[PDB]
Amino acid sequence: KSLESINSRLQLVMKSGKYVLGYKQTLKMIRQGKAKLVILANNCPALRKSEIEYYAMLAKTGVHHYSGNNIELGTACGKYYRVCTLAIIDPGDSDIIR
Amino acid sequence: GRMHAPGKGLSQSALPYRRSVPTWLKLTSDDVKEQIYKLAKKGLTPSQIGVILRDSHGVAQVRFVTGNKILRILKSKGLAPDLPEDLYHLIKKAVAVRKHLERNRKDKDAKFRLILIESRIHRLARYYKTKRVLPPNWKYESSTASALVA
Amino acid sequence: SAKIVKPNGEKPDEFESGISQALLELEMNSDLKAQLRELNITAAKEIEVGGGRKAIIIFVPVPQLKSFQKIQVRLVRELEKKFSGKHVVFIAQRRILPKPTRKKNKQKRPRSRTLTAVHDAILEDLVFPSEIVGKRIRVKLDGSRLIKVHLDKAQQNNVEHKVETFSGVYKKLTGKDVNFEFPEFQ
Amino acid sequence: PLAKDLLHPSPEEEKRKHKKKRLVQSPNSYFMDVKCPGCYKITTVFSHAQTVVLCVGCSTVLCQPTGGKARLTEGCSFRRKQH
Amino acid sequence: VRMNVLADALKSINNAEKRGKRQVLIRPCSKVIVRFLTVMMKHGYIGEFEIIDDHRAGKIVVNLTGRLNKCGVISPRFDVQLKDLEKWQNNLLPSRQFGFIVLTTSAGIMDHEEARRKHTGGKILGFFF
Numbered sequence: 001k002s003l004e005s006i007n008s009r010l011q012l013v014m015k016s017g018k019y020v021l022g023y024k025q026t027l028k029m030i031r032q033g034k035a036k037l038v039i040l041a042n043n044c045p046a047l048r049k050s051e052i053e054y055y056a057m058l059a060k061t062g063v064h065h066y067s068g069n070n071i072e073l074g075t076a077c078g079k080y081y082r083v084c085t086l087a088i089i090d091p092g093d094s095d096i097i098r
Numbered sequence: 099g100r101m102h103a104p105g106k107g108l109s110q111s112a113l114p115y116r117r118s119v120p121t122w123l124k125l126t127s128d129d130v131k132e133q134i135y136k137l138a139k140k141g142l143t144p145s146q147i148g149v150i151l152r153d154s155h156g157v158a159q160v161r162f163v164t165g166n167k168i169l170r171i172l173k174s175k176g177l178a179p180d181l182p183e184d185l186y187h188l189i190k191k192a193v194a195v196r197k198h199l200e201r202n203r204k205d206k207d208a209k210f211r212l213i214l215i216e217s218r219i220h221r222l223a224r225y226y227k228t229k230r231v232l233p234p235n236w237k238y239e240s241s242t243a244s245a246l247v248a
Numbered sequence: 249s250a251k252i253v254k255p256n257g258e259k260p261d262e263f264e265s266g267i268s269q270a271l272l273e274l275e276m277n278s279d280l281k282a283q284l285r286e287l288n289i290t291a292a293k294e295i296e297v298g299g300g301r302k303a304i305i306i307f308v309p310v311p312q313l314k315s316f317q318k319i320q321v322r323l324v325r326e327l328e329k330k331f332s333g334k335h336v337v338f339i340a341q342r343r344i345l346p347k348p349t350r351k352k353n354k355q356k357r358p359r360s361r362t363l364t365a366v367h368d369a370i371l372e373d374l375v376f377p378s379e380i381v382g383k384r385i386r387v388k389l390d391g392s393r394l395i396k397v398h399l400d401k402a403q404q405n406n407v408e409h410k411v412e413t414f415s416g417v418y419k420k421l422t423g424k425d426v427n428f429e430f431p432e433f434q
Numbered sequence: 435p436l437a438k439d440l441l442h443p444s445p446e447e448e449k450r451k452h453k454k455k456r457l458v459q460s461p462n463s464y465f466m467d468v469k470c471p472g473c474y475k476i477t478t479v480f481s482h483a484q485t486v487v488l489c490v491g492c493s494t495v496l497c498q499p500t501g502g503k504a505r506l507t508e509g510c511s512f513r514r515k516q517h
Numbered sequence: 518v519r520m521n522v523l524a525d526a527l528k529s530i531n532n533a534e535k536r537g538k539r540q541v542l543i544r545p546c547s548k549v550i551v552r553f554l555t556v557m558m559k560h561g562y563i564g565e566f567e568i569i570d571d572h573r574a575g576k577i578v579v580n581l582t583g584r585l586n587k588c589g590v591i592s593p594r595f596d597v598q599l600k601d602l603e604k605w606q607n608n609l610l611p612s613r614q615f616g617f618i619v620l621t622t623s624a625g626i627m628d629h630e631e632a633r634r635k636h637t638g639g640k641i642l643g644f645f646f
Contacts, residue, residue, distance in 0.1 A: 108454065110453075110454060111461070112453035112454060112460060112461045112462075113459065113461070114459070114460060114461050115458055115459070120465075120515070120516065122465075122478070122515055149484055150485055152480050152483075153479065153480045153483035153484060153485045153487060154477075154479065154483075154485070154487050155478075156465055156478030156480070158465075
């Protein structure tokens with residue numbers, strides 16, 4: 001039930017909230033301190049995963065390890081390209097509890 | 099009987115003969131409206147909006163109190179979903195069945211159910227293109243439908 | 249004659265000036281004029297019902313029908329006190345549109361303007377202190393139709409004496425026989 | 435029986451028949467005012483509610499969805515709404 | 518799925534009449550059914566019938582007088598002219614002394630004797646005798 005719920009919340013973040021897709025933009029958003037949630041596919045390189053976890057620990061932001069891969073994370077975002085890392089600027093749908 | 103099942107069930111909803119709003123309902127038309135709006139921002143489809151409005155806020159029929167249906171209100175304010183509720187759910191079911199099938203070759207029963215699901219999807223899509231709800235060139239492709247739902 | 253509250257298409261009036269009087273000297277009542285001054289009347293009509301009993305029919309605009317019914321049960325008694333021995337009913341002018349025959353641009357006729365919808369609508373707001381919980385139509389062996397209307401039965405104190413006047417006024421402005429009965433619990 | 439009165443049957447056989455098979459359709463459900471203990475506000479809930487109903491003033495559940503009828507939590511009183 | 522409301526109604530009256538019931542309930546009502554039953558009643562074949570009005574399609578309860586033999590329907594509403602009305606009349610009716618054929622004409626829903634009286638044809642509806 002967790003996977004379908006997180007997929008539905010991810011869909012509702014799209015079309016209703018501000019997000020960003022990709023690795024470089026995710027790092028850029030984290031180091032500006034305006035990313036509220038970082039979602040990583042398990043297909044992510046381990047070095048990249050560890051570095052993003054360290055960045056989020058520095059920025060005090062939550063990391064969710066998505067139970068798919070970059071293909072299924074791209075599908076969950078409504079896109080036709082693989083996304084391996086994404087950052088949520090603001091949910092607009094109670095994905096991140098206030 | 100059912101469209102794709104040998105069932106002849108009768109479970110329905112008996113709408114009462116009294117179309118008038120109940121006296122004990124203090125909610126006026128516009129109040130029920132912002133209730134719909136806030137619960138549409140939460141992502142609830144019109145069926146769920148009607149269900150929770152009947153269950154919790156005690157309104158019997160949105161149409162009886164406001165004069166318009168739930169989807170009409172959502173469309174008038176322009177926050178109605180791009181795909182229809184039932185077609186969206188049918189596509190979601192088809193995507194789930196295909197995802198289960200790509201791991202299970204020997205599930206021929208799942209293949210049969212998938213054929214039934216896609217048959218209903220195509221018939222509903224033909225109906226919606228007839229009423230110009232959908233674009234005339236709107237087609238359901240099994241490969242690209244995964245990005246449309248969930 | 250002071251006729252301040254009577255808007256409609258045609259400028260004169262006959263005996264409707266009297267109802268407009270009785271509404272204007274309904275001033276300094278028990279706090280009704282505050283929610284009544286923004287209100288208006290379309291037409292009025294006196295007909296004979298029952299034996300030697302008169303009933304007054306009041307025609308009102310459709311948009312203000314709900315605001316009227318919100319206070320209808322209040323001002324009916326003062327209007328009956330003004331005109332003793334008479335019953336007051338509030339009806340909306342619904343402007344029946346003719347059915348489009350085969351005989352230079354007219355829009356599609358709304359279903360609210362259709363005649364059957366007008367008739368059962370003016371049946372519903374006529375008996376507003378009660379509500380129609382069921383309708384029954386009997387064909388009396390020769391093509392004539394008699395309509396039985398089932399009321400709420402929740403109240404038996406202020407409508408049971410006006411069913412004759414209801415039937416008379418409905419025969420007057422609709423032309424079909426209707427009788428009223430109160431069924432048991434459902 | 436060849437002379438059953440279809441026009442005026444007694445309410446016993448009207449309540450026992452199915453909702454659709456009655457002379458006029460009547461829903462078997464109703465609305466109902468529930469009073470949770472320890473709170474003042476009155477909540478109107480569908481009798482056959484499919485969702486858990488919560489107070490806005492207290493984090494306590496009122497009814498649990500079941501097959502046909504919502505089961506109220508113990509200690510909650512209830513009445514009908516205009517029969 | 519129900520495609521001919523009048524057919525199901527007329528079959529219901531015919532079956533209840535054969536079973537000897539005093540009243541019959543037909544579920545889907547329509548203007549055509551009301552006119553057909555009015556034609557039957559004006560000829561005395563049925564008693565007073567009552568229309569139950571729900572906000573859906575209403576229901577009709579018909580008082581059966583016991584003097585009806587058959588009230589069948591012609592499902593394909595054939596175009597019936599005055600020239601070939603006699604062939605329909607002697608193919609569907611038991612005799613020439615009685616039995617009536619209801620056909621919808623431009624002047625209304627109406628039996629074949631009055632249709633020939635006012636010189637008009639129309640589409641076939643059914644027959645009763």
